[PDB]
Amino acid sequence: IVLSHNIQHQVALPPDLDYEYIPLSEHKPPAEPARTYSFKLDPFQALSVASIEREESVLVSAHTSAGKTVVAEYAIAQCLKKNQRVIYTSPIKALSNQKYRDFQAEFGDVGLMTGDVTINPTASCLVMTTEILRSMLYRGSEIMREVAWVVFDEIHYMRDKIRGVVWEETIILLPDKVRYVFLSATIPNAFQFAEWIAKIHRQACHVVYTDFRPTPLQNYFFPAGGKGILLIVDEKGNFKENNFNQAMAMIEEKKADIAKIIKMILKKNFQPVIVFNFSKRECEQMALASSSMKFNAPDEENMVNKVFENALASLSEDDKNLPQISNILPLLRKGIGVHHSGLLPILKETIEILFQEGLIKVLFATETFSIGLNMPARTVVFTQVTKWDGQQRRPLTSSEYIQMAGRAGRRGLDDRGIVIMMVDDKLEPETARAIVVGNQDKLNSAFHLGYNMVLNLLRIEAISPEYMLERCFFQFQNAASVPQLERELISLQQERDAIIIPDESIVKDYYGVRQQLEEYNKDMVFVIQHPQNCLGFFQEGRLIHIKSPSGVDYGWGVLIKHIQRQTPYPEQESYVLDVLLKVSGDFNPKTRGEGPMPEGIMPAGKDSKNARWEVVPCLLNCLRALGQLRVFLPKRLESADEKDGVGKAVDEISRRFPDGIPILDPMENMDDSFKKLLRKIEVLESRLVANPLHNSPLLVELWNQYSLKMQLGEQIKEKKKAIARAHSVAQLDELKSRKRVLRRLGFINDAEVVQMKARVACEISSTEGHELLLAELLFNRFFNELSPEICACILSCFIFDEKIETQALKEELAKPFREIQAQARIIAKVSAESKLDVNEDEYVQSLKWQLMETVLAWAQGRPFSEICKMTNVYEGSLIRLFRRLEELLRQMAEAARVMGSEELKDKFELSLSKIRRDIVSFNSLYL
């Protein structure tokens, strides 16, 4: 077969094994297909659904807009037909809820489990996040026994530095009998992933890949302060080099541009447009520049006011009053939207809704909006292409470009998607070209050990940590990489052992000396050529010695004058001195030519004809000695016998002072410690002339060889390291260390049996969030006498890694914080004690205390407005922190329960009741 169009298929088979057997036919059909129609299937869908129908797992690799969700539906239907259960894991928050709404309306027998809520836990199809899958798995719930199929939507999130590990963990933990549908972006090494699944779960895994986009993209560049946009990638995906070149020239010649771009987009009916930025602040800034315009008809204005109010009706005439709403509404009314994680969740949803219904023509959003469900536009504008990964500025990866740009082009309603990238004031071509002809990044494991992990593996009879390491995807990519690396290492060793033909050990001395001279000579040029020490002595006729650009020697010359041109940026390189020198190789220039260094002028002399003596211009970076003498120069100094005549007076002075000519100390009086750090540089210059090598001609041959050997040695050491971190033992060191920690702290015995404290520590699941320390805290007490509302605030002290400002701490609050920071200190201690790369101070200091009072007063009954007034943290971030906090609290009630402190557990529940109220207890618009 049937349909055909740029579709690649592959299959993964388990490692032998593959020996017996079970053949006899087992080759189609074999079952009927549920919910085929309505629309005709695309061949890539047909293929993947065939894989699923045959009960074989399959990884689909296609762009997000390509319609991957249809395949998920089929597995659910098939599961529902066989009275089986299926699990839809979504990577993150809101979209799982949305997908739940879609599946609920479709299949009815559907439930939802997130951090915030639980729906229909007996349903045949459970939508849940990966993290909950991890917890429920470690807990070993019997539900998992009935599960036949797991669909992973957006599986490429396994490459996430903090959350990828969760994905991997739950994959490894599933029973081999289970089958998987992996939905992914067009990653390049899908096959490898399939193969890993095949090995570890002893079953086939198909891979369906295709380079298919329903609506094609055109990419345009806008240079900053430029006059328009340049098409740089056309519908056929052909790169137009020349326009890029023109654009960069448009930037070499070169706030408000965003407004002009939007106005242009408006004039040509390219709306709706998503304008991406990478900071909430930048988002609001951009909206301010935009806000002069108005994109809605009075009827549209009416429509959005009606929809908005219809959403707000559930709240109250006091919640309606937060200034984020009152002053966001005039923007919405003008047809301008904003979207970022700082807004209230209810605004994120209602703004999404107003965008989907076509009431918002321009939407300024941060990256996260790019992965929202079914919300594309006609045009996408990148406000920049630089993102901080930390103390570095990254040009956004191809995968990011794909993911964001995929929101352009609306399948039903648009002929094409228009993508306009505003460019940075400075940018090299190879990086941009790499992005726009984007090759997707590997799905490389980001596995790392965690305390909840290790503890849980140890806790269960039939499984072990060593197992997990052996079966890890990271390790699989290692066991793949290693033979290539040992082959590189061997090639390097051969080159090393083969280039060892320079002989001598005087070379080593030479290298050391040369580099020492370059550094010390740099010190000497520095400061001594600076006007602050050197300048004052600018009399006419004074004899000065010239440093020469690199290291040559034009000898002593009489200063003629000194000029300084300002437009010449280093301190030393600024003043220009005209000096008379005993020039020979002229040639270039004539009189005044140049410029950057005297150029063509060759020193000496002695072997001249043709000596000349002329006044040449040099800059102040070029200097060295200044000497202590001045001759009287004639006022009319432009004649053969007279320039050369001054020269005659110079040779006679030089003949009069052997072992001289004595020089001016430049630093003495506007000391001198530097001089004793100055004679040695000369000594080393004598060591150089002493070296037999200095004369031979090979020289540079032997030197470049020495360099190669030293480089190769460094590279080799590095390769042995890469091999070490390609070997399971690196991570195993981390493991043995963490085992030391667990013994020394008392969570498990030396016989590797989990204790009650380990068992309670198990039930705390947080991204990096110490999880240990809370357990220690409990058994150490430090919670016995706190009221619930106080306890809330203290627990709030662990989730916020964001910045807030401006408050003092009362003593009755500063002290418990201090005591916990003390516990953190003992823990980071034992951590260093056990060879962990933990930086003992950053751990201890990671528990930020500046938000204790906001949460405390919220827990004591303050209204939302007031606590929003007590900090600069964004409203949405605040509600997010509360939501993690509630989830955390449920976890703490659990661990208290599982250590029999019934009183603590009930207390935490009561705390939940204080926190879990009003807007913080808000249900989702989708549910």
Numbering used by the authors: 141 to 394, 425 to 737, 744 to 846, 850 to 1106
What's in the article?
Neurospora crassa FRH (frequency-interacting RNA helicase) is a 124 kDa homolog of Saccharomyces cerevisiae Mtr4 (56% sequence identity, 73% similarity), a Ski2-like ATP-dependent RNA helicase that plays a central role in activating the nuclear exosome to promote processing or complete degradation of RNA substrates. FRH has been extensively characterized as an essential component of the circadian clock in N. crassa, a function which doesn’t exist in S. cerevisiae and is not dependent on enzymatic activity. Like previously determined structures of Mtr4 from Saccharomyces cerevisiae, FRH contains a largely unstructured (169 amino acid) N-terminus and five structured domains: two RecA-like domains, a small winged helix domain, a helical “ratchet” or DSHCT domain, and an arch-like insertion domain that includes a KOW module. The domain is composed of two anti-parallel alpha helical coiled coil segments (arm and forearm) that terminate with a β-barrel fold (fist) containing a KOW module.
The purified protein was crystallized in the presence of 0.2 M Sodium Citrate pH 5.6 and 19% PEG 3350, resulting in a trigonal P3121 crystal form (FRHTrig) that is unique from the previously published orthorhombic P212121 FRH structures (FRHOrtho). The newly determined FRHTrig structure retains the same general architecture as the previously determined FRHOrtho structures. In the FRHTrig structure, the RecA domains open slightly (12° rotation, 2.5 Å translation) with respect to each other as compared to the FRHOrtho structure. Furthermore, rearrangements in the ATP binding site in RecA1 result in a conformation that is consistent with productive nucleotide binding and hydrolysis as observed in nucleotide bound Mtr4 structures. Thus, the FRHTrig structure appears to be more representative of the native nucleotide binding conformation. (3) The most prominent difference between the two FRHTrig and FRHOtrho structures is the conformation of the arch domain. Rotations about multiple hinge points in the arch result in a 30 Å displacement and a 70° rotation of the KOW module with respect to the FRHOrtho small cell position. Hinge points are observed (1) at the base of the arch where it projects out from the winged helix domain, (2) at the junction between the arm and the forearm, and (3) at the junction between the forearm and the fist (containing the KOW module). Symmetry related regions along the elbow, forearm and fist/KOW of the arch domain interlock to stabilize the extended conformation of the arch domain, including the 70° rotation of the fist/KOW (as compared to the FRHOrtho structures). We conclude that FRH is a monomer in solution and the structural dimer observed in the FRHTrig crystal is likely a crystallization artifact, although we cannot rule out the possibility that such a conformation may be biologically relevant under some conditions not yet identified.
